[PDB]
Swiss-Prot record:
GO terms for cellular component: outer membrane-bounded periplasmic space. Changing residue 19 to G: Retains less than 10% of wild-type activity with phytate as substrate. Changing residue 391 to S: Retains less than 10% of wild-type activity. It holds the Pfam family His_Phos_2. Monomer. Changing residue 18 to A: Retains 50% of wild-type activity with phytate as substrate. This is Phytase AppA. One of its GO terms (biological process) is cellular response to anoxia. Disulfide bonds join 77-108, 133-408, 178-188, 382-391. Optimum pH is 4.5 for phytase activity. Optimum pH is 2.5 for acid phosphatase activity. Optimum pH is 2.5-3.0 for acid phosphatase activity. Changing residue 304 to A: 28-fold decrease in Vmax with pNPP as substrate. 1600-fold decrease in Vmax with fructose 1,6-bisphosphate as substrate. Does not affect the Km values of the substrates pNPP, fructose 1,6-diphosphate and tripolyphosphate. The lineage of its organism: Bacteria, Pseudomonadati, Pseudomonadota, Gammaproteobacteria, Enterobacterales.
Length: 410
């Protein structure tokens, strides 16, 4: 029987938090629709129990997957430290780490380590906001505008079809924002009523107006769907095409603010350092978060911006068949180090593991038989590859060292 020529030696999963209630409920959100937003079973921004179950499924899947690759034992709790879990201080990320452990090894109580000070943000997930490093305002401004085609106006102008789809879903024409508008000489328009401007500072970047609103609203519609609510978008979202059109507004914002290299590299450096050190073979030692690296499996509960920052920084591009959100709740950026038995050389494979929107809607349990979606990624900047398209450890290490911003390391 043909035997595998590669042996899995280490896995690093950067995961976005699972399904959660929208993070805010502003007046603007109510003014763009005459309808009422459906309420959620948990506080704003918190993980819903269904979201935890969905993450638990991925945890269950990963356990089966890793067992077949012989990295984890089929029975019992993983050895001490064999599995390490790190999470951002947010309630949803902490709970996502807990839901993953529960699914990976039920009743095994794998600790979910976070920064000790839980009332302060963790720079690992955003060194910009905590002041670890700064963005070059002038350079970032030019890079974002450049990728926008010169202006936000031209950017949004190319996505009016998607904006009109959102307006339709919101029944925008019959909203307070529309009715109480004075310049009623022209038709009501989200992009016109809320001009979008690029804001750039040393610690942050943002798009005001319709761009950021549309990006948040469409994500909420996705959240309603994944949460299993009766009629997302008030029943006005009836087919896959509409889902894609709507979410494209969401992916569009991330393309500008989170994938742009001038922002991504800085914002992803701490995570790049962690990932590299965890994937690089070396003597174990209690490190950051009280975790010992390297180890078999490291699961990091982060956010969608983290996945996008890492994609931009590593030049990893992807689209997820069945999932309109490129960085969906529970989505996992998976890094694996495989050793080639023939010569003991080290290789790194990157992929994006995720649940399709329907698998979230139907809350379908996962397993090797019913696996979640998975896309094998290709590091666009890697030259030295093996038969299976993986990048050599040296190649990967070169890519990370050139991408990271030293000034942003922790
Ligand atoms: O960590 P927070 O301070 O609570 O900020 C959150 C978080 O963004 P980050 O990646 O910067 O952490 C959400 O991302 P997830 O944790 O869900 O992965 C994002 O939600 P979306 O981008 O998916 O919509 C949301 O933004 P939003 O206003 O659209 O809810 C945003 O909140 P802020 O805009 O206030 O920073
Ligand atoms: Hg800890
Ligand atoms: Hg280490
Ligand atoms: Hg996202
Ligand atoms: Hg998202």
């Amino acid at each position: 029987q043909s035997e595998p020529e590669l042996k899995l030696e280490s896995v690093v999963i950067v995961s976005r938090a699972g399904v959660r209630a929208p993070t805010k409920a502003t007046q603007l959100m109510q003014d763009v629709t005459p309808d009422a937003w459906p309420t959620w079973p948990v506080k704003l921004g918190w993980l819903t129990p269904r979201g935890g179950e969905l993450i638990a499924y991925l945890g269950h899947y990963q356990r089966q997957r890793l067992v077949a690759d012989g990295l984890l034992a089929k029975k019992g709790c993983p050895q001490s430290g064999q599995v390490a879990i790190i999470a951002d201080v947010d309630e949803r990320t902490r709970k996502t780490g807990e839901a993953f452990a529960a699914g990976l090894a039920p009743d095994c109580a794998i600790t979910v380590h976070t920064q000790t000070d839980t009332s302060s943000p963790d720079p690992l997930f955003n060194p910009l906001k905590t002041g670890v490093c700064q963005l070059d305002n002038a350079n970032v401004t030019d890079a974002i505008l450049s990728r926008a085609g010169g202006s936000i106006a031209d950017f949004t102008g190319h996505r009016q079809t998607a904006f009109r789809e959102l307006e339709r879903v919101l029944n925008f024409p019959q909203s307070n924002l529309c009715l109480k508008r004075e310049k009623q000489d022209e038709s009501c328009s989200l992009t016109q009523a809320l001009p979008s401007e690029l804001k750039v500072s040393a610690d942050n970047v943002s798009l005001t107006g319709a761009v950021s609103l549309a990006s948040m609203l469409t994500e909420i519609f996705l959240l309603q769907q994944a949460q299993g609510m009766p009629e997302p978008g008030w029943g006005r979202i009836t087919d896959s095409h509409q889902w894609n059109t709507l979410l494209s507004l969401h992916n569009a914002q991330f393309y500008l603010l989170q994938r742009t290299p001038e922002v991504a590299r800085s914002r992803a450096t701490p995570l790049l350092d962690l990932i590299k050190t965890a994937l690089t073979p070396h003597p174990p030692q209690k490190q950051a978060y009280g975790v010992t690296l390297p180890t078999s499996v490291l699961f990091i509960a982060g956010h969608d911006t983290n996945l996008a920052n890492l994609g931009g920084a590593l030049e990893l591009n992807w689209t997820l068949p069945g999932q309109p959100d490129n960085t969906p709740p529970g989505g996992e950026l998976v890094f694996e180090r495989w050793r080639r038995l023939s010569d003991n050389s080290q290789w790194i494979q990157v992929s994006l593991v995720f649940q399709t929107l329907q698998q979230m809607r139907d809350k379908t349990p996962l397993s090797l038989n019913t696996p979640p979606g998975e896309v094998k990624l290709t590091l666009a900047g890697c030259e030295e590859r093996n038969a299976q398209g993986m990048c050599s450890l040296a190649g990967f290490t070169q890519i990370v060292n050139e991408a990271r911003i030293p000034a942003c390391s922790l």
